[PDB]
Amino acid sequence: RATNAQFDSPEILRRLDVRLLEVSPGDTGWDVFSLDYHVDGPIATVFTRECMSHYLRVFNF
Amino acid sequence: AAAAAANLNAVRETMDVLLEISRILNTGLDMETLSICVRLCEQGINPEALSSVIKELRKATEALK
Amino acid sequence: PVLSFLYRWIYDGELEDTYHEFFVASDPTVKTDRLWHDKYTLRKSMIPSFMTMDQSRKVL
Amino acid sequence: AQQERDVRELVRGVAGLQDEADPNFQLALNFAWSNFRFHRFLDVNSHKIEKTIEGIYEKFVIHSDLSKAASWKRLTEEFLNADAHYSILSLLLCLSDSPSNSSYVETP
Structure with missing residues (x-):
């Protein structure tokens, strides 16, 4: 805010x-x-959970 | 006996698996210590009761070092 | 009959045969979100000769 | 019987006191038995432990040591052939974290 x-x-x-x-x-x-983006719509079909680990790793770096 | 030897072989295998598990979980134990712990929970004892003991005993040997 | 099954797969978009005569292999599970990738599978035996493999993939 | 022997050996080895006439050994042994004869402890749930093993495996793959992670899952899967399992496991878990190795002398 x-x-x-x-x-x-x-x-x-x-x-x-x-x-x-x-x-x-x-x-x-x-x-x-960590930051978590929540996927609850139909959009989980386009972004899978193994790609979420990548965002986590780059964000960690 | 013969099967008792191969059983003992498999116990060496299990204590080496547990040694790998301890070294990447990076504990203060060596092989002979975790053997004694394996005796303790083979007869049935609390890991949460053993852990507090090991955690202060490793801190009560840096207190007079 | 073949072509009626084809138009059961373009204007219905759903496989309903209880026998294996169609080049699509629908799964009984209806999944949660992995539905889109895996539920529909190409049956490579009910490919007819007047239809190449490309046409089947495209209409699937 | 042999439980009391194991307790005495563990306190002697870990606390590094090789005299049984040391009063510090006696106070630590009294400490140990008073801790053992006391119970306030959450009796462990195996399902939580299985979820914990999974979460450790996930933290392994997050920090990208794939050989360690896959060997870890393979070792735990092989280990759980045939209760004492989970007891030992949760002990090893509880005792230490905040660092990780990478498994030297591994070809099997």
């Missing part, structure tokens, strides 16, 4: 949300952070 990110339709803004990974006993926030 503070920055320029808000300017888009509420559905795709809702579909972006934070996400955790497998936690460690020796945990920190820099160990575990």
Whole structure:
């Protein structure tokens, strides 16, 4: 709401949300952070879950 | 016995599989320690009770090092 | 009969034969979202001679 | 019988005390038995453990060590032939993470 990110339709803004990974006993926030785009429409047919790992890896880098 | 030897061979196989599993789960144990743990949960004991012990005992040997 | 099955596959878009006479092999499962990729499979024995492989893929 | 022997050996080895007349050994042994005779513990559910093994395998493929991930799934699949399995497994899980190796001396 503070920055320029808000300017888009509420559905795709809702579909972006934070996400955790497998936690460690020796945990920190820099160990575990991710963004999750939610696919619940028919659009899962065009984007599969193995390509989501790629976005995660590039975002991690 | 002969089948008891091949059984013992398979127990060496299982403790090596568990050694791979320990080394990429990157624990403080060596082979002989996890053998003792295998004895402990072969007779039936809590892993959540053993883990707190191993976790303070490894911290109670850096306390007087 | 063949051509009526063909127009059962263009103006209906659904395979309904209880016998194997058509070049499409419909699956009983109707999946969740992997439906589109996998439910329809080319039967390569009920390809007739007046229809090449290209035509069958295209109409499928 | 042999449980008490195993407890004494584990505390002697891991705590690195090779004297049984050390009072620190005795206090740690009393600590250990008081911990064992106490129970507040969530008795483990095997289904959660299976999901955890899957999640570790997923974290392996996310961080792109495919040989480690595939060997890990293959080893766990071979291991679960024929309860004691899950006990041992969850112990190994609980004891440490936050780092990962890459499996030297592997051709089988």
